[PDB]
Amino acid sequence: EDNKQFFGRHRWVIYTTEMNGRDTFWDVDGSMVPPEWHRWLHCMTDDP
Amino acid sequence: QLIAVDEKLDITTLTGVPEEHIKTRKVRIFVPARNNMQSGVNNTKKWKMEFDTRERWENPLMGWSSTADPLSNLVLTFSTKEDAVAFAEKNGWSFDVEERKVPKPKSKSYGANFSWNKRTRVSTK
Amino acid sequence: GVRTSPTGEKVTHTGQAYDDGDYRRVRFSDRQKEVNENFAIDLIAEQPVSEVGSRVISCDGGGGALGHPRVYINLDKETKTGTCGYCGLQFRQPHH
Amino acid sequence: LKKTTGLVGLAVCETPHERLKILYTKILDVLGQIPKNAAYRKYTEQITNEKLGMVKAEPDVKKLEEQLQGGQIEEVILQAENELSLARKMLRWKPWEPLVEEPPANQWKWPI
Amino acid sequence: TRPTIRPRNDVVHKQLSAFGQYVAEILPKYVQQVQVSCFNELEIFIHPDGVIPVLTFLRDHTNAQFKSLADLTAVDVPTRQNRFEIVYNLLSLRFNSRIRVKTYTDELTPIESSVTVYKAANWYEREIWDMFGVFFANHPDLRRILTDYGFEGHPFRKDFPLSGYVELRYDDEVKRVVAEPVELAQEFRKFDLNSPWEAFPAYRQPPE
Amino acid sequence: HPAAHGVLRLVMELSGEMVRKCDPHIGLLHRGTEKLIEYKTYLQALPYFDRLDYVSMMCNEQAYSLAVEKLLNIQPPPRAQWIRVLFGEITRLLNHIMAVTTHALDIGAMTPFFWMFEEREKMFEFYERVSGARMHAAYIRPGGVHQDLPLGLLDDIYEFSKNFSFRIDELEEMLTNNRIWRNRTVDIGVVTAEDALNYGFSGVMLRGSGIQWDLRKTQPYDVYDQVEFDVPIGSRGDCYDRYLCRVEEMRQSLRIISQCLNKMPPGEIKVDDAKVSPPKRAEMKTSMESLIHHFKLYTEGYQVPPGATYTAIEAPKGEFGVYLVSDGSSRPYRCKIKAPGFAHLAGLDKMSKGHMLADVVAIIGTQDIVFGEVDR
Amino acid sequence: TYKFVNMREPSMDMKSVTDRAAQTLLWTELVRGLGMTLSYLFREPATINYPFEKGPLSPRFRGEHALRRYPSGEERCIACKLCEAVCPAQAITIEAEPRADGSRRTTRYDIDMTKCIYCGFCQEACPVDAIVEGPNFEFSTETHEELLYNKEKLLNNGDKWEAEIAANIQADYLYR
Amino acid sequence: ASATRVIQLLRNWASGRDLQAKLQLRYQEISKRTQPPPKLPVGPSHKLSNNYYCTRDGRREAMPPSIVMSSQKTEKKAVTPAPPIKRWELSKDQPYL
Amino acid sequence: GTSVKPIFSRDMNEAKRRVRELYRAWYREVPNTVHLFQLDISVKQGRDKVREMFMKNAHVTDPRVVDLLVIKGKMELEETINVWKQRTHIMRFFHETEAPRPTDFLSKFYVGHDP
Amino acid sequence: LHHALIPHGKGGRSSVSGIVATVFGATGFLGRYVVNHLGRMGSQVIVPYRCEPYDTMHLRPMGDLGQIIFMEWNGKDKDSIRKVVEHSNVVINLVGREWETKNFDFEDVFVKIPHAIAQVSKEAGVEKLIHISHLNADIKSPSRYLRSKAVGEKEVRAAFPEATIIKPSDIFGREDRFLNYFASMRWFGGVPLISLGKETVKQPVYIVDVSKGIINAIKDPDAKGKTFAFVGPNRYLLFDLVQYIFAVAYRPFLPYPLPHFAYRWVGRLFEVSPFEPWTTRDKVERVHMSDMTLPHLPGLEDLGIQATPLELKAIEVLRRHRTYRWLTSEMEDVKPAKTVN
Ligand SMILES: COC1=C(OC)C(=O)C(C/C=C(\C)CC/C=C(/C)CC/C=C(\C)CC/C=C(\C)CC/C=C(/C)CC/C=C(\C)CC/C=C(\C)CC/C=C(\C)CC/C=C(/C)CCC=C(C)C)=C(C)C1=O
Ligand SMILES: NC(=O)C1=CN([C@@H]2O[C@H](COP(=O)(O)OP(=O)(O)OC[C@H]3O[C@@H](n4cnc5c(N)ncnc54)[C@H](OP(=O)(O)O)[C@@H]3O)[C@@H](O)[C@H]2O)C=CC1
Ligand SMILES: CN(C)C(=N)NC(=N)N
Ligand code: SF4
Ligand code: SF4
């Protein structure tokens, strides 16, 4: 997070290079976030 | 002046219905029976015209109930048996008319529950 | 508790499983059958029976407005437990 | 006098009073053909004489507009023309006659 | 005060009733009935052959300057001898009011086109024809407006099924879209929602 | 076609590039909305209006809700009415942004489109926070609104309203005095006041022609009689005058938004009549009458007394009306929908006399046609 | 009240005439437009770095559907068909029967996500908060059939998103 | 926002307005995504006494439309649907643009 | 009503005249329809289809119904002449992708429950 | 029958026809037509494919939801064959190339693959098996294509005695080889013909007729173990046929005799293309060969299909080969070719 950035770019995620059994170094999906971090990232709450 | 047509009215050629659903359909004009689960009689006021039941099968996927009959859900409301009959005749469908069934008047008396010499006396309240 | 049919297909909590000769089993070939492994009947069996010292109990499912509508269960028949049917929860008067 | 009427296609008239008197006189002349007992003739004659009286007693255009309460004087002229055409059509149609035909027994019933 | 009940407007009700009497007196030849609804909406039921005179009067008369044709539609009531009910909604800007004019017709009886009174009547009557089968006599260009080219039947009639009779798909054999009889994977489920208990005593009808 | 809004077939007869006649073919987006409404209940038919003019969603919802409430003889609470007016003006800003920016895009200007669509994204955020859906909210319902505002919505709306006049000024810095824009829009599609009235134009068309008519002023609904705003009036009745009218209507909608924010009252959000509007969740889960009424309202729905009404509002594209006929049951017997774009597109042919292809594009843009509401 | 958008007239004095002539010959308003565009060029863009940055949402957001459970693990749905009755698009199909323990539980609960309009009436009409519209919206599929959900799929969605759904319901249940 | 003064001055000169006074990006000035719990008002018809539904039933006050004239069944002044609309007054705030 | 309002054509003779006029208009148009739409059918096939469509309403004995039918026929023709239609609709007149529906009682009994 | 295999509906798109068909080689001309007919009828169709999934895209709109299932298969993989024929009561074999690639030859595509499909289908209990062969399938034929056709037909009959073996003559249609191959000789100046095409007689058959016959053979109960010959109603000389093709295409016709060995060398030159070859020596042999007459075998009239003459559906294929000058010329504008009956 970086509160100095404008609303929308003040929270971001760096995806992992391997999830479950998939080589996810390049092909990163927007559905890879678990529900709790999904809520925090989409800003439904300010509590991580 | 004004012409005269001494012939029965028929708009089947204009309605656009397929010939199969014009010729092989027998509608049912009737007053719906009162839902036995309720004492309300406000749904038995108007005549209804409904079509005959056709085939329904099970969808291979999701197991839903498929159909091929366009007039399966087509129910019309008519104020009078004559109006419904005229509509069915002018649209060309066959029709079966069922007379309205109204309950016969009944004699009710609260004091009959305590008759001195008749079987109408009740054993409980 | 999932169970396996004689054709090797898992049964859902509703007992659904295609027959051996059913052609519709071909849809799962090269794919998977979506079955939920948690059975509500088994879980609610796992849940215990509460004991309260009153003839009438009130169940709302817990949480207040987050639960089911409040209902009242009559704990008079001692041969069986009183089950709130919204949430399938059993209550019982302390006998003995 | 005024540059524009504020409405597209509505030209300013430099002689409002003369045009209004001419139009109202023509309307009154057309209404003379209508039978006396017709209710269209009485009301239209009344309103026309009421408005024709105002244009002959007020030389100022703005006060005349305030009295007529019919928008600007150009709008009043246009409405007078429409009334004249309507009077001619009504003379042709003759709607003071009794009802053409009663509707069927249940035509305006609702709910049904 | 009653916070949950819409207030009434006796002034507007009386004004509308007076104007309804006015028009009924002016045009006895066509005006069959006049009504004012309790939420202040004036309605006039006229004979079908008086559409042009009534609309021209309500448009050009000084006391009734209904310049704008707000709406024009039809209502299908199969139980009536004349099923189609043509409705005109007019707006008078000078007097800040609205009026409604209702006529009746059936399948085979034309209704005089009112494009000489209001220009919007062109497309409104085209839509009425396309959706109900009502033919307008002197229409400059009367043809389907909303339905598909070559569509059979008038969809908005009460006796026309919801899903129609045909459906479209692309057939690879003929390399074009084709129309085939309708066939639904899941049939529309008809719900009987009316309660058998009377809701409004004020609208009760005589048993007859 | 980029300028045909995707779903309009306009059969044109051209002599060179001069237009001889325009023959708009519509119905490519006809869905049978009125028939489906006849088959649905009153609560189940609200999203149909939500999807009619998909740039003025809460405006369509407000018109339908006003019709149903007039037939029901009930009254929304003042807080509900104020919310309805505030979001109606927000939706008017959305629609005017869309109209002006798409007009400028069809003419050849795109940067205002991008800027004003960032603003539209912010207003979509407002919509989503208040309803859960970014555009198709289904928020305004017969009897009031579905849910109350969150506890930061008013402050965020105030911030957006404060920082929007500069956006409108930046839009005007690019088009208003630009000679190319003036050449494209001035004296194009001129319609006289009498022709507009006869053809049945409403709203921006009439006001551009010079007709002093605005439903929000003449026939107020909700609490539009308690707010102060001005009605822009055109002089030449062309595309340029209509564009200026739309921009000034955006500014006046900002005025109304400010007034609504300052005058937001307390109270409940739906009519306190559980036989029409659903009760709260706690009341449903604790009260027998409330549970019964919730069950009946969400299964059968409220019955509307028999009668027919025509209720119209000043939607951003003109007079949007609904003629609703109820036969005493829980489902509407008839629902005719009068979209302002229908009459305008009907009048498109007359406005394109002696013009060219680019002029026809500009005239379509200034008519601001949405074919969802045109076709229904 | 009303106001005129275009009713002004230019002064015909020599200075104003020369100013207009200079504007005509020297494209002053065109230079103004160029300056505005250059200002926007030097401003900071509003583009977010999707999918690494996600747009803001609210607890009321309507996304993918889910079937919830009580904390005990029992299903919340009681087969009351209120959602099926109120569904505007008729996208919900329900069939029920008495369970082995006599509970009123569904055997078929199908939602057609190609027919649903995501209007949220089902979660309003649910008296037990069983059916919900969760927060997920990234569930696009490569085949049509994958969007025809059934009870197993909806229960899987509920189990997968239960924490976020419960948090959102806790955050927003006082407005309902 | 975060920008150099020189670029800000160039933007101000090119645009002619102080951009930092009114920006188009949101920097911590909006309400926090977490808010205290509310307690909404209850309503006017939530009394425990003198509250009967027959006295506040809006639907049952609806009446069939009054039949002003039905064909089936002095000098009166001509009337109008309503008094003519009064002339709109020019805005005092900004009559002309 | 005994005195029904006539659309036009009064009696059945003028209605037949309008029917013949519309038939001539359709007949002279089939070559143009085949040429412009680039149909793969013969001109004889198009004329036969026009004849069949005319003949399926040969049992009408009401002048008003005949007038409405010829009005709709003129509407259909003006759709074809102005190329408002496509090859899709013109071929929709031919039902080219339907399986031959059985008409005998035994075949109907075999296939399903359809009367 | 299983309760899921009982036909229901009115034979539409959403009906149940009781047919579960595995269509090998569905990613082809006859394959696409057969799959379209099955889906229109309302049957369950399994499409085993080895190509890119992109090239199977046109088969998707051919059936309702869940009726078309795409499963990857390998020709020389009995495991994949069993996987794709496990749950189907009808198996249709349409696999075949007109040329020989590096990995697959005429022996592979016409003997090994059909025999494997027939044998695996028998083990899986498939009720019906339709196998497509060629009419001119001769064991001593000059063409390796036809020799392999005959050997594979014998192998299929040995493996699955209850088969229906169909022998189309020369399928012509939009995506065909025949009419396109004869109409694509414009680019090479004139039209080379062996003996000027005066010694060859051919009766091509319409693709829709072939597909309808294949569908009817499934529904016909007494066609279990039979051999059908699908030929057109008219027999033409090769010269007359090519002349009619060029006349309909509105292209100038300049035929010339080319000796057989020279034509074989020309075909040898064109088959060095790694991609789909324009022509091959086997193709030249088949074109020169006359279509056989097999009166004893049944046909389309026996299956209930009236053969569609070439003169009616020739314009569907050959209108694409015209220019803008003659694009709109009508079907009747060209006289029918001179038949040999
Ligand atoms: C409902 O509907 C909708 C609408 O209403 C219909 C709408 O309005 C809108 C709104 C839409 C908009 C607002 C969009 C419009 C606005 C915009 C800003 C869009 C702007 C668009 C553009 C700018 C498009 C222009 C760009 C294009 C078209 C891309 C073209 C790209 C190219 C690359 C051109 C081709 C160039 C070529 C081929 C050059 C090739 C070079 C060579 C051959 C040279 C070879 C050299 C060598 C080989 C040398 C090699 C040398 C080396 C060193 C390499 C060696 C290394 C090795 C490894 C080998 C939307 C969204 C909508 O939804
Ligand atoms: N067409 C004609 O004129 C005649 C054809 N026949 C026969 O009818 C059948 C169908 O012919 P047709 O459709 O025209 O030809 P195609 O070449 O167009 O179709 C052949 C089909 O088989 C597949 N296939 C080819 N080789 C292999 C392989 N090694 N492994 C797996 N699949 C393979 C192809 O798929 P892919 O896309 O992956 O290559 C394609 O689906 C053939 O058996 C042919 O011999 C009989 C008489 C006349
Ligand atoms: C307004 N609508 C719906 C558009 N598609 N607009 C557009 N400019 N493409
Ligand atoms: S969101 Fe609306 S349309 Fe979708 S399933 Fe729920 S009730 Fe039905
Ligand atoms: S409303 Fe809730 S409890 Fe009722 S059937 Fe639907 S999901 Fe189940």
Ligand SMILES: [Zn+2]
């Ligand atoms: Zn409980």
